[PDB]
Amino acid sequence: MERKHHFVLVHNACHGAWIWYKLKPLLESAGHRVTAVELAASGIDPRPIQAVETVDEYSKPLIETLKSLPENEEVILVGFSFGGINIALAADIFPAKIKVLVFLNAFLPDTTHVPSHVLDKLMEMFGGWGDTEFSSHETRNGTMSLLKMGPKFMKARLYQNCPIEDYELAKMLHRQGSLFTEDLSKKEKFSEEGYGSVQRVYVMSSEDKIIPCDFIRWMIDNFNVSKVYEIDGGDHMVMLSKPQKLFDSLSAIATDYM
Amino acid sequence: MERKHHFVLVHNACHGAWIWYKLKPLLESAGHRVTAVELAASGIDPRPIQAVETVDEYSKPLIETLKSLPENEEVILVGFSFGGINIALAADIFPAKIKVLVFLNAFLPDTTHVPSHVLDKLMEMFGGWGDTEFSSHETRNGTMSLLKMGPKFMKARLYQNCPIEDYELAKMLHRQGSLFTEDLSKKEKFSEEGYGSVQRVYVMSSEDKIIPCDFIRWMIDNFNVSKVYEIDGGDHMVMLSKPQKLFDSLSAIATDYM
Numbered sequence: 001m002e003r004k005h006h007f008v009l010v011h012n013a014c015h016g017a018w019i020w021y022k023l024k025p026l027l028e029s030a031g032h033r034v035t036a037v038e039l040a041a042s043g044i045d046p047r048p049i050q051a052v053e054t055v056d057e058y059s060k061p062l063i064e065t066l067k068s069l070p071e072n073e074e075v076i077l078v079g080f081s082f083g084g085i086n087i088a089l090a091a092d093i094f095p096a097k098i099k100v101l102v103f104l105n106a107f108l109p110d111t112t113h114v115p116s117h118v119l120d121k122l123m124e125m126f127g128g129w130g131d132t133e134f135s136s137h138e139t140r141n142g143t144m145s146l147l148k149m150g151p152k153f154m155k156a157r158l159y160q161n162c163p164i165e166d167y168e169l170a171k172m173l174h175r176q177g178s179l180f181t182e183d184l185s186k187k188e189k190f191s192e193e194g195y196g197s198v199q200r201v202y203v204m205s206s207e208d209k210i211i212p213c214d215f216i217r218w219m220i221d222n223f224n225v226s227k228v229y230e231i232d233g234g235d236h237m238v239m240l241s242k243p244q245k246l247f248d249s250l251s252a253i254a255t256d257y258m
Numbered sequence: 259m260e261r262k263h264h265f266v267l268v269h270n271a272c273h274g275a276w277i278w279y280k281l282k283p284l285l286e287s288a289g290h291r292v293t294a295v296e297l298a299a300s301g302i303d304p305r306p307i308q309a310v311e312t313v314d315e316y317s318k319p320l321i322e323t324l325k326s327l328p329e330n331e332e333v334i335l336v337g338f339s340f341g342g343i344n345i346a347l348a349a350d351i352f353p354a355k356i357k358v359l360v361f362l363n364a365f366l367p368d369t370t371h372v373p374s375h376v377l378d379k380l381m382e383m384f385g386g387w388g389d390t391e392f393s394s395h396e397t398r399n400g401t402m403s404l405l406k407m408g409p410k411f412m413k414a415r416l417y418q419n420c421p422i423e424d425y426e427l428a429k430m431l432h433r434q435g436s437l438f439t440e441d442l443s444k445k446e447k448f449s450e451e452g453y454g455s456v457q458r459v460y461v462m463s464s465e466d467k468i469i470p471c472d473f474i475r476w477m478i479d480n481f482n483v484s485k486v487y488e489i490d491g492g493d494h495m496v497m498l499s500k501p502q503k504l505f506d507s508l509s510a511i512a513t514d515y516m
């Protein structure tokens with residue numbers, strides 16, 4: 001049997017490690033190791049998002065997971081949605097720990113514009129926020145913009161191809177979060193020597209109704225990848241609507257980096 | 259059609275409303291309404307268990323859900339495991355709001371002994387906590403015993419008949435909690451005029467490795483119920499391992515109290 005890999009999986013804003021409940025055992029039955037990180041103020045993390053003011057604090061559990069890998073171990077690092085920004089941050093710290101970055105229906109930042117660039121572009125373009133609730137919290141370093149998904153918006157825009165049980169689960173577990181847009185507008189650009197040096201691939205769902213297939217091409221034209229994989233019939237929450245096809249794409253990716 | 263009901267579902271210690279994610283849509287498809295309560299320090303509730311120092315604080319979100327119900331509305335109140343204690347507590351406060359109490363693989367207290375009686379009986383004969391972590395938290399109410407389940411103990415004793423996905427989910431979501439046995443040993447006995455006046459039924463799983471059949475028969479012999487229902491092949495997490503059969507049992511109950 002060919003070499004197996006260690007996958008580090010990074011969830012989206014307002015969610016938590018729980019999203020990976022279908023995919024983790026698929027990967028582990030094929031002999032791979034999986035670590036599903038829970039970011040700060042996410043899932044069952046005991047902090048409210050208001051206490052996590054910066055994207056570096058938010059991302060700290062991912063940095064700590066990578067820090068604790070033994071010497072010379074490398075992972076396949078998979079970021080979902082805002083998890084794209086998280087994994088780029090990590091890649092700028094620990095580039096030699098990362099065999100390949102998997103941007104899964106994810107923000108794909110560049111090394112030319114401020115780190116918020118691709119998030120700011122989507123916020124300008126997106127029209128279907130529905131019953132999502134937006135709010136602010138003032139910090140000692142400025143306004144921090146917060147969001148809490150509404151259930152109608154979830155159903156129409158994230159979960160529309162998911163089993164109803166999955167939607168019910170999400171309604172039980174989703175939390176107010178942040179896309180850290182102010183904090184990311186003030187951060188130093190992602191570096192070419194760190195983030196830019198790491199191999200990267202993009203995995204996109206064909207029915208993602210939050211991260212559209214033309215906004216992806218925009219991001220990819222803006223900052224190229226090695227390879228683009230497409231998951232036929234996936235919604236945004238592809239690890240819940242099409243976990244087997246997602247396993248298939250991750251499997252393929254593992255084969256290209258053995 | 260027959261009139262439908264409003265089910266209020268109460269989870270077990272260390273868990274949260276998320277346990278109900280398969281059952282909830284089954285009951286809603288059948289036309290019923292469903293509230294899955296999240297108890298203090300449970301699931302995504304923002305407080306750690308160290309902040310919830312009494313069973314009455316732990317139960318307060320159930321109390322508030324019952325208090326909020328419109329005038330003359332009555333619910334089918336389902337308590338799972340330690341949920342049995344919480345629904346007995348609620349029945350002693352709002353007995354006229356409850357059509358029937360459903361003890362589901364649950365502790366069934368009486369009105370003769372201290373509230374912790376049936377737990378004390380189990381805890382005395384129980385062995386093999388496995389990798390479960392026990393700790394003590396000192397409070398203005400005395401010592402509070404905390405537990406955090408270990409994953410080997412979960413797999414063997416709680417989830418042995420569940421899909422691997424459900425076991426992975428639970429590993430992602432379970433939290434340190436408490437059975438509040440100190441506080442329950444000190445509390446006033448449940449009253450015959452409140453709790454004792456409410457209709458009650460028991461639903462047991464045949465393969466429950468936490469609450470064994472013989473102990474259930476002893477609780478029911480000591481505090482009678484109107485009817486007993488059994489779910490063939492269910493583990494303790496019967497809402498995960500046999501949701502359809504649990505639905506079938508709750509349907510049968512709802513037909514009985516139309």
Ligand SMILES: [Cl-]
Nearest residue numbers: 012013081082
């Ligand atoms: Cl996101």
Ligand SMILES: [Cl-]
Nearest residue numbers: 270271339340
């Ligand atoms: Cl329990």
